[PDB]
Design a protein around this ligand. Sequence first.
Ligand SMILES: *[B]([O])([O])[C]([N]C(=O)[C]C1=[C][C]=[C]S1)C1=[C][C]=[C][C]=[C]1
Ligand SMILES: [K+]
Length: 358
Amino acid sequence: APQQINDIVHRTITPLIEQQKIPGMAVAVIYQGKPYYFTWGYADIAKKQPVTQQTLFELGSVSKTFTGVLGGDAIARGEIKLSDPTTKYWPELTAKQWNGITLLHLATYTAGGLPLQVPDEVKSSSDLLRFYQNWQPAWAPGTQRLYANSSIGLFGALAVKPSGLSFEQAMQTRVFQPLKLNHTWINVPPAEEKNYAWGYREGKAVHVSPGALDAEAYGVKSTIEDMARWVQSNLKPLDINEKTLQQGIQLAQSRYWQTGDMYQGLGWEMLDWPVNPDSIINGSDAKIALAARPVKAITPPTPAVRASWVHKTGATGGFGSYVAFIPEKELGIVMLANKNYPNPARVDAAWQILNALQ
Ligand SMILES: *[B]([O])([O])[C]([N]C(=O)[C]C1=[C][C]=[C]S1)C1=[C][C]=[C][C]=[C]1
Ligand SMILES: [K+]
């Protein structure tokens, strides 16, 4: 690999791993479009299995970028419109607070304060309808952003209804297969278990547990090679041959709302580049505090801006992931770890590496 990439990655990541006591980590840097891979430590401490380029990590909320793109692909196919009220796809949601809440609001966390998590007690289709019917918004739609699994998760489930496919089947056939993400899974098959890393929380080996809207909000597992390909695909959508998927990727990076320095896409979040890490932390869900932020509508949405820091953080109980890329520099990074460590440390490391290579 080019020595400049080797050096900045190792000099940045080694201290990160030591400081955060991460058991295993994989990193990919996409430079001028080509991927370069790095791995450290262990996928399974007890069984002494090393992290490799084939190790599967839980992406946590980075899964929302796949949900946003799959929804963009459905818009491009003419199956749904973001301006469509939620009730068009779920007539059974008769409670009055749903009047005026559109798919756009679900996809961008602006429905009026849907909760951060779907409760563990929600286990059936009937339980989920009850949950949404009983939810009382704190705000009118389209006024404040409150990051939430229950918002984009519902968007994902509804976006695939016209297709006649399950969410998993739609993701596989419309996003994973065309992009050749052949080791990316919503459900890890038994054949792939040998590469599935364990996550570590308080020193115990753990995997994410089943939950309502898990696939849609935080349930993808992938390797560092497939994630590098996902970044490549989002950096250069015009190279994608499937027309609706190319258009869907473009729609997911459009700018729909602004709050401070951040712009909300579908799954992806963006800031104008150049920008420093402190502003990225304060202008993203990477900050430690859970925040209600008033938003300004971008009417109409701005098409994907090349000079942007486009990114997404993700976590499960035992994993911490981060993806960031800058289209105009053809530069990106993926960091996958089997410990959920502080988001600010992820941003600091990613920025140190990309700033050195831009
Ligand atoms: B995402 O922002 O990473 C999201 N992830 C999950 O809900 C998956 C988890 C299962 C157990 C712990 S995290 C997230 C939303 C809200 C709080 C933390 C992470
Ligand atoms: K589920």
